[PDB]
Amino acid sequence: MNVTVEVVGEETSEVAVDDDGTYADLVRAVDLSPHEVTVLVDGRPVPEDQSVEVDRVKVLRLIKGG
Incomplete structure (x- = not known):
């Protein structure tokens, strides 16, 4: 689903x-x-099974390289 991810640097994507x-x-x-972009989710305990199985993760703009 759609989830807000904190992009390294400024602002949120x-x-x-x-x-x-x-x-x-x-x-x-x-x-x-x-x-x-590459999105990863940390295996942490959360009540995502209550309403809308969503998760907050960190993602970097575009692919890592140059």
Whole structure:
């Protein structure tokens, strides 16, 4: 699903995640994002099974390289 991710530096960006477990993740796995960024989710205890299985993660703008 859609989750707000803290981008290294300034401001906050929105990136798609796959660990969420929702339908959005299924399509996300095909990498259909114009930004093309790497999103990772830390295995931490959270009540995401209450309403809207969402998770907050960190993502860097574009791919890491040059």
